[PDB]
């Protein structure tokens, strides 16, 4: 079971980095402005809910940049993360005070994944 469960995470992580690895080589000015909110505490898997909530903005942010630069279809990846994020919880999301950039955002969830992907196997 956990065996089914770690593989999914590995995947989530994976195109979380596709977004990251797609916004750096890149209006990243105007893009680095939008202000996301990060969880106060992201340790257990059920915390991922705090990730689902922000996805709507994540899309509205990526559609600032047209689709030629990125090697990922924005509506798609999001559409796909959501699906992961959903199957992975199964409570209410309480947010943090400070606000972070899309980059500081992904970095944080990417890491969130790497934690659980370490602590299992």
């Amino acid at each position: 079971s956990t065996k089914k469960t770690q593989l999914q995470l590995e995947h989530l992580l994976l195109d979380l980095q596709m977004i990251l690895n797609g916004i750096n080589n890149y209006k990243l000015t105007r893009m680095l402005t939008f202000k996301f909110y990060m969880p106060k505490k992201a340790t257990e898997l059920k915390h991922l809910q705090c990730l689902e909530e922000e996805l709507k903005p994540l899309e509205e942010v990526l559609n600032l940049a047209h689709s030629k630069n990125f090697h990922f279809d924005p509506r798609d990846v999001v559409s796909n993360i959501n699906v992961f994020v959903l199957e992975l919880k199964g409570f209410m999301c309480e947010y943090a005070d400070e606000t972070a950039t899309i980059v500081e955002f992904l970095n944080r969830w990417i890491t969130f994944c790497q934690s659980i992907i370490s602590t299992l196997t």
Binding site: L7, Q8, H11, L14, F72, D76, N80, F84
Partner: protein, 195 residues
């Protein structure tokens, strides 16, 4: 029997064996569906291509389950001929690698590259390749399988004969999946050694 394979991008290929007939693909957690008319191949076998999206867009996920139904007209209505609960990532088959080209030929050596076509980034590097060489003395079947247990989009062939006609082929398979099978062989790349 009713068999389908997912190409890891936006395409599900279908085979049906038992007049108008179709396959319907209904993702258990998407707001879309897709169909296509089944066309004949063998005497009593039909094939079909379900286009989920743009050629390289990622339309399905490893948590997705797509219900696959085959339907044939039965008077007024449609009849459900076959049903399957299809986990796309458990039934992977990739296109044959493309853009085969000689990176570097010598008289006793050769270096050949290829591209994987429409491979999901979810695989990262967990891929496998098989390659083989048609030398003048043998046929393709008798040609040894060259094992690359890693993602490597080139091969350096040693122990070649100068002024010798060779053909080369390579195929690809993800590590993931219970029913995943090798891709079809790539278009054979033809090349010849220096004297």
């Amino acid at each position: 029997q009713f068999t389908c394979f997912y190409n890891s991008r936006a395409q599900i290929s279908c085979v049906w064996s038992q007049t108008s007939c179709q396959v319907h693909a209904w993702p258990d957690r998407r707001r879309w569906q897709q169909t296509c008319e089944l066309l004949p191949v063998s005497q009593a076998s039909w094939a079909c291509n379900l286009i989920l999206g743009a050629p390289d867009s990622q339309k399905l996920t490893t948590v997705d389950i797509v219900t696959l139904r085959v339907l044939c007209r039965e008077g007024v209505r449609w009849r459900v001929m076959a049903i399957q609960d299809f986990k796309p990532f458990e039934n992977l088959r990739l296109m044959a690698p493309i853009s085969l080209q000689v990176v570097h030929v010598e008289t006793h050596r050769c270096n050949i590259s290829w591209e994987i076509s429409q491979a999901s980034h979810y695989f990262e590097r967990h891929l496998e390749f098989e390659a083989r060489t048609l030398s003048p003395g043998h046929t393709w079947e008798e040609a040894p399988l060259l094992t690359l247990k890693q993602k490597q989009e080139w091969i350096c062939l040693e122990t070649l004969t100068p002024d010798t006609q060779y053909e080369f082929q390579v195929r690809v398979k993800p590590l993931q999946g219970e029913f995943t099978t090798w891709s079809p062989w790539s278009q054979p790349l033809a090349f010849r050694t220096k004297p």
